[PDB]
Design a protein around this ligand. Structure first.
Ligand code: HEM
Ligand code: HEM
Ligand code: HEM
Ligand code: HEM
Lengths: 146, 138, 138, 146
């Protein structure tokens, strides 16, 4: 992938304004609730027995923060995404056997979380740039599946 | 299928966005063509520049189709009768683009209506967009 | 939905392969586990070796459920009741895997009855497999 | 990507028995018939009006042969797949905008066609090797999207 100057500006600028803990918790709660088969991977987190429980579950919240911190580590180093995610690829693929289609699903959810968070600042160009990012991170994460 | 709760959630989002359907239809396509440029090739007979009368005119129709599906949500196949031949048989729209358009629609609602798409309501609206996709690609 | 052509096509292949449905279910699952080993995680407590008695016993039931759904092609949903909570609620089967299993059933029909699986019959069976899938992930 | 000796042998052995013209034609005919939105990329091929029209369309047959021949180039250099398909990746992604999901659908169909042509010799393990191959060809072709 090749990043334009425009794209890097849109991505870093908005990242700088993200509340990670909030958007992380939103993103993971939504993964589990919009796509409930993904709960299979997170049974160790405790009470997942309703939407309110998923949303109030302290492990979902913590885990969410770490996922979106992970995306920040792409944002910080946009030309070395493949390597930034190499151990994560092994974890998700070689050990967890999370199908890659779920990485796409998480990214789409993150776009919608950001939309809600930023309103009109989340311009079309900005959405374009952030979709490319989640798509490039999804690809880096599927690398050791292949 | 769409559960009772799903139909209530989707009717409830459409009640709130209904007065702006037309402007959200437009924005949805603008975002579709910008975020996923490969989708432009379906509209090569449109001027596809920001604020085009064709894009705005078409957005209005797409949002209206969604409003009608929401209004007759018990039977979306029948309500969206005539759009299925067109998308599936004539336009030969790759099924993957339906999620893209749906994804762009939810970004528009989220932008304008924070706290409307709770996780649950998001889940319901996702199942609604999917059932609509399924009708258009059959 | 499945067309009337689709239903006659899927009925014809099941009519032809019915005497062998059991062995073809076993073969399907073996292909699934070999070709797509990540599916083996759903069966942590099965003997999954080539030939295993237990993959055979499970195969027989999978094929039997495909045979019921074909028989009741107009109401597959009620046909396959409480296969759906099993697969969607208890086991949480990722939707993408139904596609993998379908692909392994199609190879199996192709191997043993290649003249039955014309491209039109393959299309009908593909749509039928998606509908069984859509019931079990609902 | 890594190939075991078992896989390498199962691939080069089966390949040297594949009638390319016939299998190629049939694969591409199947793609156009099972997934008909694929027909929109081939309007210059004339009459795709029906399953019969598609199967005996001579542009479909000649182009099928070429598609499968392309796979032959993958078999003849499994370690050089990325580089071997670079030019075809540009065609499909930059000029044609074929969604990469279509590459895996054509892969699935070729396997079904190989299955029909090889009967009981297309053993589960043979299916696994060819699955792995059609997957890496699809990835090589998608390289310009990423
Ligand atoms: C696509 C972008 C994704 C990113 C960037 C990501 C990131 C991460 C990170 C950073 C960790 C380790 C966190 C820690 O060390 O505490 C992790 C673990 C994990 N991830 Fe992901 N993930 C992604 C997608 C997914 C998806 C779609 C699923 C399942 C649907 C998933 C399931 C898991 C599971 C089960 C763990 C181990 C959690 C535990 O039990 O502690 N990941 N991921
Ligand atoms: C998923 C929700 C969708 C809805 C509700 C929808 C609805 C509509 C409606 C109401 C029309 C107007 C019919 C007419 O007056 O001729 C239309 C036409 C059209 N649609 Fe869609 N559509 C959807 C998805 C898509 C997608 C994903 C694409 C392609 C990426 C697409 C491409 C087109 C094109 C090219 C036309 C004809 C435009 C023209 O030339 O007037 N549609 N659709
Ligand atoms: C055509 C699609 C499928 C059909 C018709 C089908 C049918 C069945 C049947 C008949 C049973 C046994 C229920 C019983 O004995 O009471 C079963 C159980 C099961 N299915 Fe499926 N299934 C399908 C797809 C899948 C897929 C794609 C997976 C996983 C990737 C899966 C995973 C399982 C598991 C783990 C069990 C329980 C096994 C056990 O522990 O005994 N199924 N299914
Ligand atoms: C992943 C497996 C595929 C391989 C290995 C492959 C390979 C090739 C080859 C060798 C050509 C010949 C270039 C030429 O001489 O014109 C070609 C062209 C082409 N391919 Fe593919 N292809 C694949 C998948 C697809 C798919 C899934 C589609 C669309 C559904 C597609 C659409 C086309 C089109 C429209 C052309 C241009 C035909 C023309 O007008 O000359 N390809 N590809």
């Amino acid at each position: 992938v090749q990043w334009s100057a425009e794209e890097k500006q849109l991505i870093s600028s908005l990242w700088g304004k993200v509340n990670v803990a909030e958007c992380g918790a939103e993103a993971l709660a939504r993964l589990l609730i919009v796509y409930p088969w993904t709960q299979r991977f997170f049974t160790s987190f405790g009470n997942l027995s309703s939407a309110s429980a998923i949303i109030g579950n302290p492990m979902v919240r913590a885990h969410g923060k770490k996922v979106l911190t992970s995306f920040g580590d792409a944002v910080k180093n946009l030309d070395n995404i493949k390597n930034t995610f190499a151990q994560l690829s092994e974890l998700h693929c070689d050990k967890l056997h999370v199908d890659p289609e779920n990485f796409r699903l998480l990214g789409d959810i993150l776009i919608i979380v950001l939309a809600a968070h930023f309103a009109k600042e989340f311009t079309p160009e900005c959405q374009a740039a952030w979709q490319k990012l989640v798509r490039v991170v999804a690809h880096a994460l599927a690398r050791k599946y292949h | 299928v769409l559960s009772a709760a799903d139909k209530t959630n989707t009717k409830s989002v459409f009640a709130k966005i209904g007065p702006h359907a037309e402007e959200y239809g437009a924005e949805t396509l603008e975002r579709l063509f910008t975020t996923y440029p490969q989708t432009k090739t379906y509209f090569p007979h449109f001027d596809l520049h920001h604020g085009s009368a064709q894009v705005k005119a078409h957005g209005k129709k797409v949002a209206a189709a969604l409003v009608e599906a929401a209004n007759h949500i018990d039977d979306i196949s029948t309500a969206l009768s005539k759009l299925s031949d067109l998308h599936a048989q004539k336009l030969r729209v790759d099924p993957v683009n339906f999620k893209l358009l749906g994804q762009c629609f939810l970004v528009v609602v989220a932008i304008h209506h924070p706290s409307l798409l709770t996780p649950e309501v998001h889940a319901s609206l996702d199942k609604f967009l999917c059932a609509v996709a399924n009708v258009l690609t059959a």
